[PDB]
Subunit: 196 residues, 6 copies
Amino acid sequence: MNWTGLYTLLSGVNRHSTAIGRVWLSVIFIFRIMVLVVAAESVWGDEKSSFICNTLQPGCNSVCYDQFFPISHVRLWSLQLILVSTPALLVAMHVAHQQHIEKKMISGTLWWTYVISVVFRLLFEAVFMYVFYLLYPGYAMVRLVKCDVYPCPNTVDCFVSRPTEKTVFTVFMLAASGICIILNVAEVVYLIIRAC
Amino acid sequence: MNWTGLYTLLSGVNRHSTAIGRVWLSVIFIFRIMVLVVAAESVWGDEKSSFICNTLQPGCNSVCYDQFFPISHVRLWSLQLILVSTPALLVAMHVAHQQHIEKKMISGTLWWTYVISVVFRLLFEAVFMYVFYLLYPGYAMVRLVKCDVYPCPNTVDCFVSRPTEKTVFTVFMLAASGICIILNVAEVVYLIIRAC
Amino acid sequence: MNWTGLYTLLSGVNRHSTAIGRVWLSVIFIFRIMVLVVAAESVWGDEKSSFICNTLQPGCNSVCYDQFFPISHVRLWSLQLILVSTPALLVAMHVAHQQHIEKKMISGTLWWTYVISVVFRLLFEAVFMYVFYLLYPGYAMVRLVKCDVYPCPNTVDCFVSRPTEKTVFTVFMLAASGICIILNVAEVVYLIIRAC
Amino acid sequence: MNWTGLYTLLSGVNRHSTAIGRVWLSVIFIFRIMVLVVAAESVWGDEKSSFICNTLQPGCNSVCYDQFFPISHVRLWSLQLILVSTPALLVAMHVAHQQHIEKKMISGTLWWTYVISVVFRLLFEAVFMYVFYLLYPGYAMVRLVKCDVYPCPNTVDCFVSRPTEKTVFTVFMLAASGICIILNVAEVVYLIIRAC
Amino acid sequence: MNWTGLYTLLSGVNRHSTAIGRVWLSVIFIFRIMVLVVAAESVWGDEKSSFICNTLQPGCNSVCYDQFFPISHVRLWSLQLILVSTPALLVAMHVAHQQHIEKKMISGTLWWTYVISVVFRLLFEAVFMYVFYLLYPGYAMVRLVKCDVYPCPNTVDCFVSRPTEKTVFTVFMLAASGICIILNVAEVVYLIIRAC
Amino acid sequence: MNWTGLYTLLSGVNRHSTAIGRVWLSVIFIFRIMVLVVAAESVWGDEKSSFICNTLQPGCNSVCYDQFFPISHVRLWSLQLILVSTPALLVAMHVAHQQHIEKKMISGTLWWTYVISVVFRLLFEAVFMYVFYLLYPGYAMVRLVKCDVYPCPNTVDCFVSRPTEKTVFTVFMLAASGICIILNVAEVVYLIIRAC
Ligand SMILES: CCCCCCCC/C=C\CCCCCCCC(=O)O[C@@H](COC(=O)CCCCCCCCCCCCCCC)COP(=O)([O-])OCC[N+](C)(C)C
Ligand SMILES: CCCCCCCC/C=C\CCCCCCCC(=O)O[C@@H](COC(=O)CCCCCCCCCCCCCCC)COP(=O)([O-])OCC[N+](C)(C)C
Ligand SMILES: CCCCCCCC/C=C\CCCCCCCC(=O)O[C@@H](COC(=O)CCCCCCCCCCCCCCC)COP(=O)([O-])OCC[N+](C)(C)C
Ligand SMILES: CCCCCCCC/C=C\CCCCCCCC(=O)O[C@@H](COC(=O)CCCCCCCCCCCCCCC)COP(=O)([O-])OCC[N+](C)(C)C
Ligand SMILES: CCCCCCCC/C=C\CCCCCCCC(=O)O[C@@H](COC(=O)CCCCCCCCCCCCCCC)COP(=O)([O-])OCC[N+](C)(C)C
Ligand SMILES: CCCCCCCC/C=C\CCCCCCCC(=O)O[C@@H](COC(=O)CCCCCCCCCCCCCCC)COP(=O)([O-])OCC[N+](C)(C)C
Ligand SMILES: CC(C)CCC[C@@H](C)[C@H]1CC[C@H]2[C@@H]3CC=C4C[C@@H](O)CC[C@]4(C)[C@H]3CC[C@]12C
Ligand SMILES: CC(C)CCC[C@@H](C)[C@H]1CC[C@H]2[C@@H]3CC=C4C[C@@H](O)CC[C@]4(C)[C@H]3CC[C@]12C
Ligand SMILES: CC(C)CCC[C@@H](C)[C@H]1CC[C@H]2[C@@H]3CC=C4C[C@@H](O)CC[C@]4(C)[C@H]3CC[C@]12C
Ligand SMILES: CC(C)CCC[C@@H](C)[C@H]1CC[C@H]2[C@@H]3CC=C4C[C@@H](O)CC[C@]4(C)[C@H]3CC[C@]12C
Ligand SMILES: CC(C)CCC[C@@H](C)[C@H]1CC[C@H]2[C@@H]3CC=C4C[C@@H](O)CC[C@]4(C)[C@H]3CC[C@]12C
Ligand SMILES: CC(C)CCC[C@@H](C)[C@H]1CC[C@H]2[C@@H]3CC=C4C[C@@H](O)CC[C@]4(C)[C@H]3CC[C@]12C
């Protein structure tokens, strides 16, 4: 493994991306992948097993955990990464297909599809940011929550596992997503300006 | 690892597949594999260990879990992926075998076997969709289930683990399967139209 | 990794195998390996930890589990795969050795050893099918078993984990083994017919 | 894998780094990675599961663990490694991009960006050292802690897991970080002296 | 990965080994490695956690398990494999060193060192077989054991986990070791006969 | 992977090491790595979870385990391996750097740095042997220990997990370390004798 191969793999074979989406976006993507890898198994490993409520009612822990955590942060970020990386994979596959068909026997089409893929990537980033805002208002996570879902009688106190570490990693991931959004907007603006 | 090698591996050495089954089907397959990888161990890891029923009867948890989950969603999707990818593997092996035998010493046969493999892939997709509909009517998963299987006395309340996250991943996987079905039908129609 | 390398590795360097044992047997072997990988850790992971009996007698769970599951299905299938793949490994090593010794300085010997290896593979398949029939009569697995082994007093009710999913995977593996047996018999018959 | 490839990968393709940041910094980075790998899963694997307090109050263990360990040492060191390695990754990607753009169709710019990246690496090292000092004053870790956080009544005695082994690994990691800081300062001074 | 590379790696670069130690010994070594891999984590994974004794005395389970299992079968077989494979590694390293020193600037020495390594391998096999016989007389493993070690009062009944599956794997490993011993003796005899 | 590449990687590109540190030291290093890999997860996996004391005092198990095992044998051996392998890594990186700088545009310096690295390796081996002697006097490990650390009242009996298997692996690792020390001393003596 060399740098001239890793850089080519990350950037794809596309020849229209500038240094914003070729040197900086790949680094932020690697940063997000590494943070998700080092945080998924350890911090969020025992989010449900150590989630306890102050009650004797059977089945209250599971219903309260599902009520307060419809989908954990780790899985939300994994889905966000997959959806954000899908258009880049599509562009790389399209470039490879065009190269194959021209070998066995265009610039504007590649430029347009790259612009469309960057727009879709920005849209996915914004959609996942909005979903995270809807599900979990506020970056901070609290230690104690009040759960009144059936079958729990009245309201019970349930305790979250590692609120502070999860808050730190949430801040990191949200900052990375914001940087990605800014870089995508800058890339779109730069391409439009240079094309005109 | 380069893009011109990954694309060749995903598309095989077949020269009859169009851009529908060469650029889009491979991307959807990668998407399904990644979602299954990020959801199998985490979301469905403790589906049975944290499945509890409100009873003192020994052995009621296991019989109720088997009654309500004959085969978990993760294993159903893994089997679906294996069966769907089997015809592509067969086509790739047949192409390699034909290349080997012509090297040590046809187009219509390859075209027909590719069409048959795509038809079988579509059939497997439809069969697994129908099986999922039969076993689990409705995408949504409920928190509480009523289990009256022996040895549980009368009817007991059993609680499912992470209904909402499993519902989200079920929606994702079903949408991906539907997209695969549509793409396979489009590929078959395109091949038939172009052949005539 | 390319297709022309994977196909060569799976088929070996043998030049006597026809398309039955070169295109179809390898695919079925890959199918069995993938099914075993996706079923070994998940379905059979907690076969003993969640095996409970309705008694207060210490040590009854372990003796009952050993009585009813002398060797689990996953380990039986792993041993079957290893024993079935051993003759192919022997043939590949013999071909490599012959190539090496002819390089540093025959067809009938290779043909005979390939026929013998296919016969041994068929014999191993049949032996493991018969062993599975002896140990576990019937593909279906029951939820409740009656265990009267010492030290359990009288007869106790013990509950198996995931009978239905294990039944489904047993059906899959038995069908794959039967297909392998049929393909091996067809390969032997084809070789004998073509040699005469 | 050979030495001339591993050395090139670790040093990047940059031609301005001297032997301080090319022979010694890479070795210390490998040392830190290996220590973190051998200490993360074993020593810090059960930091929360075996963290017990001398009370009957539900939820006191989790709140006390979060109070005394806002973010564990392993995750702090992983984040420190990622942030420290980010500027080197940026420099390598920039060098690859410059090589690509000069191939498809400068020294001062590379020198300045390398100096800036080394300065940022030193700044990140210092910031993480200061954060570790703020969160955990003193290298030594105590066996018993006094926790008076809600809902724990009055003050409870909580017991930390493996204080001595964690102290040893903390000493190792802090010494490695100090060596990295000294090497970065020496590299900056050497570059400035040689440039003038 | 091809067959001509795997065969060369398994056989080393030694030019004195015949087909007994080049085609058959490597296959048996691969068989032993695969069986150990598929049996180490599953069958022997919970040998101590599910080892229970019929007593209320604290610490009796651990002392009884250590009394009856001084070193588990899996670790004994792993050590046996490592010690048996050490002389082959030494021979390969010596051949590589001789090739390097002759490149930068004998047959009898290589023949003698290969014979000595085969003798040492046979000696290690015999020693480990004798150790296994001393520690565990008889291939069969019993469900119930009588433990009278301090602090257990009088004699307690302790129950072993999966006696039958462990017996099956013990039979497999002992048969493989016996085959290895026979092949090593045959190789030594063949070399001595051909040398004279 | 071939032997001529593995041997080159293990020996580095250094041209001053004799057969003692090129054929035998690498084999012993591989032996130690393999033993540590096969013993770390299995034997020492549950050293603390199954460490129980005969008392009702909360938190006595953790304090007693930390008192009697300040740092486990596995982590001590891992740190010893890392520290022993550090000078070899430094020498390899220095050789690669010298090759790079001579390519883009000495024997005594390489000889001296190799001698210094071997001396440092011997010093690290001796230091870790002395540390192991200080922490754990005697190779044998006892089943029962007497713990009188706060908060345990008076003196309690605590039971160690797998004393005999840990004793066996301790003997193996200590013998390997002694062999490494002897080989390093022999290498230093041989180099000094041949240089004069
Ligand atoms: C389904 C699960 C997915 C999970 C998410 C994965 C996401 C991220 C994962 C992966 C992204 C890729 C990472 C490495 C990229 C570098 C490639 C490279 O430099 O290639 C170059 C060198 O490389 C080689 O010659 C060897 C290539 C080895 C790549 C890694 C192999 C698999 C790693 C498995 C890891 C297992 C652990 C992974 C997790 C279990 C190409 O060779 P070259 O000589 O340059 O070519 C000719 C030269 N010329 C072009 C000038 C003519
Ligand atoms: C049984 C369990 C199965 C599980 C499901 C697996 C399903 C998915 C898994 C795998 C699908 C394949 C993934 C990688 C595909 C890219 C290949 C590629 O680009 O090859 C190219 C580069 O590549 C190389 O030179 C190195 C090839 C490394 C591939 C990965 C090695 C194993 C990874 C193990 C991962 C471990 C973790 C996996 C999970 C434990 C080919 O080389 P080239 O130089 O281009 O060729 C000559 C050039 N010319 C042709 C122009 C003349
Ligand atoms: C002990 C445990 C065993 C478990 C059961 C294993 C059973 C199944 C496992 C393995 C079976 C083999 C799988 C891959 C086969 C494809 C090989 C191939 O295509 O080679 C080709 C390309 O390939 C390369 O250049 C790179 C080869 C990488 C192969 C994978 C590396 C290890 C994966 C580790 C995975 C880790 C996870 C595994 C589980 C932990 C050969 O190269 P080429 O350029 O074509 O050659 C020259 C070209 N010419 C010939 C035309 C002149
Ligand atoms: C997302 C998770 C990240 C975790 C943190 C990772 C951080 C650290 C990880 C990785 C850093 C890299 C480690 C190896 C670097 C050596 C490369 C090398 O020497 O290349 C050379 C040889 O190499 C080859 O030909 C094969 C390259 C294989 C590299 C490893 C493959 C993936 C390993 C997966 C590991 C799985 C386990 C990992 C953990 C799951 C290049 O080839 P060459 O012939 O020299 O080139 C032509 C020669 N010429 C230039 C003179 C013309
Ligand atoms: C410390 C833990 C140890 C555990 C015990 C291990 C014991 C057993 C383990 C390993 C034994 C070796 C297994 C593979 C051997 C095949 C090699 C081969 O065919 O090479 C050939 C092809 O190969 C390649 O080009 C790629 C080589 C990839 C080998 C696997 C990489 C690492 C797998 C990691 C696995 C991860 C999972 C492992 C467990 C975590 C050589 O190339 P070639 O083109 O033929 O050369 C030039 C051609 N010419 C010579 C004609 C001129
Ligand atoms: C951070 C965690 C660290 C843990 C401790 C690690 C310590 C030990 C680990 C690693 C030490 C190295 C082991 C293999 C060494 C053999 C290399 C070799 O023979 O190269 C040769 C062949 O090789 C190839 O062509 C492929 C190289 C694959 C090496 C393994 C890849 C990553 C394995 C990942 C394993 C995953 C599991 C690991 C654990 C998760 C070089 O190629 P060549 O064709 O000879 O070169 C040209 C020929 N010529 C020179 C004559 C011109
Ligand atoms: C500018 C940024 C966003 C570019 C990022 C490139 C991403 C999207 C690309 C680069 C290399 C790609 C990987 C290359 C190879 C494989 C192996 C295959 O079996 C599954 C997909 C997977 C794992 C790809 C996923 C997508 C991937 C990570
Ligand atoms: C158009 C779409 C459906 C094409 C998808 C291609 C799929 C079916 C192919 C492409 C590469 C293939 C893999 C290549 C190599 C191996 C290693 C082998 O030991 C097991 C099978 C396995 C893991 C193959 C499984 C099938 C596979 C994933
Ligand atoms: C026609 C069908 C049955 C052919 C199947 C081929 C099988 C038997 C062959 C093809 C490739 C082989 C593998 C190639 C390389 C290795 C790595 C080695 O360290 C252990 C054995 C192992 C894992 C081999 C096991 C046997 C294997 C899987
Ligand atoms: C002077 C010192 C600091 C140099 C250290 C070099 C570091 C920063 C470089 C060298 C090789 C790099 C790795 C090379 C390849 C990959 C695979 C990719 O999928 C994720 C990033 C990752 C894992 C890189 C991370 C950063 C890395 C480890
Ligand atoms: C005739 C029979 C006994 C020959 C068997 C060959 C054995 C002893 C050889 C062949 C290939 C070798 C392996 C090749 C590469 C490595 C990687 C290295 O980092 C650790 C050692 C290890 C894992 C070797 C161990 C010994 C090994 C498995
Ligand atoms: C004579 C004896 C002591 C020589 C032993 C050589 C040792 C020290 C060398 C040989 C090959 C080296 C490895 C080669 C590649 C890597 C990958 C890198 O990402 C981390 C370091 C690591 C894992 C190296 C560690 C040190 C290493 C194992």
